[PDB]
Design a protein around this ligand. Structure first.
Ligand code: SPH
Lengths: 235, 240, 235, 235
């Protein structure tokens, strides 16, 4: 026969290998495909879809629909945050279980910009301005609007547009961040504050809800496929 | 009324090649590696080559009257100890010798015939992947005959009853010889038993004169039947 | 030697593999073929041949020639069926042991139209009209001619033509039906009724027999070769 | 290394295989051939050579030179055969040990015509006519000249030519006959009779010998190499 020399790796089974193998059903007349709607070519397509953030994971709200609603009211202006969460899309509990977080938890590395949309669900008669801020990491997380306004931010007029989108641009020392809580690849902070205040006339609800959505931008990518911690099997 | 349908389904897997493109077990040949004086161990086994020892391949073949194909034989060899109190054994080597009609059949596991100077022999090492050989179409006729409606002899007037008698449907058209199987190793202190499963795959198949498939259990190499003569179940005439 | 790396699947014996192997009888002068009549290239050729249906599997008829004969008589018109069976060519007992059924029982998947021919074997003096109906599945199987006539059907004048062919066209949700009794891939119902009635003059047999035949059309195909349940070996 | 997958048959030793193997004596300066007379390219060349038939295997003649001699005498005409043997060149005892039989016993299948030559070894003064007959099988073997003359036959005038050749043409239902005694592939019968009688003048031997020879014609071929039963080794 042809002289051959078996190298290391011979006879192993690497689950990630890509080798040919014999067909157990030769000459099978495969049913041809049809043009089903909604074909998906890349998992990032799913990550680019806005999905609702469970922003309110309090004891009484977590694992209910209330966890998706953040309550604003028409009280007097303050500089204290409405909501706060870290830019760890795979490991921050508010973001981990979003579609983006679910996809990222199958990968070790992620990079790219993010889109955070906020939808105001108060009455048409309610007016107000909010400030939505991204602070890159390395400093104290914004405790008040005075600090938050120094970072990237957007002023949202709820009276004008019920929805506001803030793009958190990719800014990182590393070319990729890990999909775990990691100090070296920490992604920064996201906060919301009252810019002026929510104002309502009489005979109007004085408390309303906003909803948060997160998605990946077109520059987003992931690497190093891995098993997720979000599913387990017992026994 | 019917619409226009651009049909795409093909009959690729129902070609006679595809229908027979499988290895089918045609025999289980048992041999023993043991001391020659035990008198209960078969140190060699001779199996006449045929597809009629099993039923599945037989039924598929007998869908047709005549066939012409090359054959692929695959030998799967399994072995085991028969007792635990006589030590162990070294890896066995098996000789599978094809004995064409007329060649001397071995009488002992180590007689001269195993020299196999002209008989093809396959030496298989235990634990190696199943042995495999191919044979072309070797019929002395222009096709194999699955059914032969005749005799090898015609009895003649004036011959006694014993003379001129041959089995109905038996002809040398299917005399393909035998396989003689032995364990080449000299015996260990403990008896070992091995089975060689022979798998047959027709290749480059051509068939002629289709027949209704066997409907009742096979009984012998012929078309005889004795048992299971009521294959149809009961069902009402107007019961869906 | 040439560096090689043995992949998974090495040393296995797949009974459906197609590999080269050494010839045990090299340089054998093969006997050349002759032009034998009736060569078969595809098993579907056998399935396209009409074979007689054991339509009458009663206790006293099954496993006799009587099982192939369905008795008509010259009684007054009724709407009750003459015969009924399901369109399960591989698993319906009347169809399973036809040549078509036998072939289909070596395959898992089947698709295509079927031909059901019926031959009237009464006297030349007998006249009558029959209705032969295919009802696609999903509704109650036709109990009477009133329901059966709503499905696909053919009116057969036995006086004119002793033989009538009804094509059961391929209609299915799936592109292939299983060759077992399966609710999801059920094929529907076939029934026969008196359209007017069988009429005979005097001095004529008042009971006669019809014979059923089934075959596959030219659009028929099968897939996923498998072992049949129609043959077994004991011990 | 190159991804490879070991198929069934790997590591076997088929004695009929044809594979390359390493040379144990590389760069050996082989002694060149010389033009020796009598080179043989095909075993059939040996089978085409006439060799003497042991026609007379009686108890007192077998395994002596007498077994090669068949005695004719000048007695009155009869229709009884001089000699009889079956056309089984590999298994008939008279033919099995001829060179043709020896070659055929290394093969399972044989086909083609045969040449049977007979040499008259009486005196020059002896005259006579003989009939040499081949009867294809399926009928009673010729008991007398009346039956034998119905088959293929030749009239041999010993006075004219001391040698007579009869060609037994290939006539067979199968394209090849087995090299064993087999009813289905039986080859027929060969017999010799007195056509008129052997006549000698006075002072002449009244008993003489004929010799038989058999060879294969140019259309002869064999198949399926096999071990012979003509040699064995004890212990
Ligand atoms: C190394 C020796 C063992 C391998 C050689 C095996 C010898 C096989 C030669 C006999 C050929 C048998 C072919 C199949 C026989 C079936 O009865 C007919 N095909 C029936 O149609």
């Amino acid at each position: 026969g042809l002289p051959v020399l078996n190298t290391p790796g011979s006879n192993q089974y690497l689950t990630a290998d890509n080798y040919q193998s014999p067909c157990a059903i030769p000459e099978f007349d495969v049913t041809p495909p049809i043009d089903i709607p909604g074909e998906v070519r890349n998992m990032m397509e799913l990550a680019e879809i806005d999905t609702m953030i469970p922003l309110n994971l309090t004891n009484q709200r977590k694992n209910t629909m209330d966890m998706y609603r953040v309550e604003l009211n028409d009280a007097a202006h303050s500089d204290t945050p409405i909501l706060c969460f870290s830019l760890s899309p795979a490991s921050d509990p508010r973001l981990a279980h979003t579609m983006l977080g679910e996809i990222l938890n199958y990968y070790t590395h992620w990079a790219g910009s993010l889109k955070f949309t906020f939808l105001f669900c108060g009455s048409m008669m309610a007016t107000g301005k909010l400030l939505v801020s991204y602070a890159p990491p390395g400093a104290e997380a914004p405790k008040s609007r005075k600090e938050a306004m120094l970072g990237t931010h957007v002023i949202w007029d709820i009276g004008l547009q019920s929805s506001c989108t803030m793009v958190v641009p990719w800014i990182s020392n590393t070319t990729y961040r890990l999909t775990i809580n990691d100090s070296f690849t920490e992604g920064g902070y996201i906060s919301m504050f009252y810019q002026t205040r929510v104002v309502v006339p009489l005979s109007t609800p004085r408390k309303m809800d906003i909803l948060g959505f997160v998605s990946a931008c077109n520059d987003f990518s992931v690497r190093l496929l891995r098993d997720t911690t979000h599913i387990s099997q017992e026994a | 009324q019917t619409r226009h349908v651009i049909q795409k389904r093909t009959r690729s897997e129902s070609t006679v090649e595809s229908f027979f493109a499988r290895g089918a077990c045609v025999a289980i040949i048992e041999v023993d590696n043991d001391a020659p004086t035990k008198r209960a161990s078969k140190l060699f086994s001779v199996w006449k080559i045929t597809y009629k020892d099993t039923v599945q391949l037989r039924r598929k073949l007998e869908f047709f009257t005549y066939s012409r194909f090359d054959m692929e034989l695959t030998f799967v060899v399994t072995s085991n100890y028969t007792d635990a109190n006589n030590g162990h054994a070294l890896n066995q080597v098996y000789q599978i010798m094809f004995i064409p009609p007329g060649a001397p059949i071995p009488g002992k596991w180590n007689d001269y015939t195993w020299q196999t100077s002209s008989n093809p022999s396959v030496f298989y090492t235990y634990g190696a992947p199943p042995a495999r050989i191919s044979v072309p179409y070797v019929g002395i006729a222009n096709a194999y005959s699955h059914f032969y409606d005749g005799f090898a002899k015609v009895p003649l007037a004036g011959q006694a009853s014993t003379e001129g008698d041959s089995l109905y449907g038996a002809a040398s058209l299917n005399d393909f010889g035998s396989l003689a199987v032995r364990v080449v190793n000299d015996h260990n202190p403990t008896k070992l038993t091995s089975k060689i499963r022979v798998y047959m795959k027709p290749k480059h198949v051509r068939v002629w004169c289709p027949r209704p498939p066997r409907a009742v259990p096979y009984y012998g190499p012929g078309v005889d039947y004795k048992d299971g003569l009521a294959p149809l179940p009961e069902k009402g005439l107007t019961t869906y």
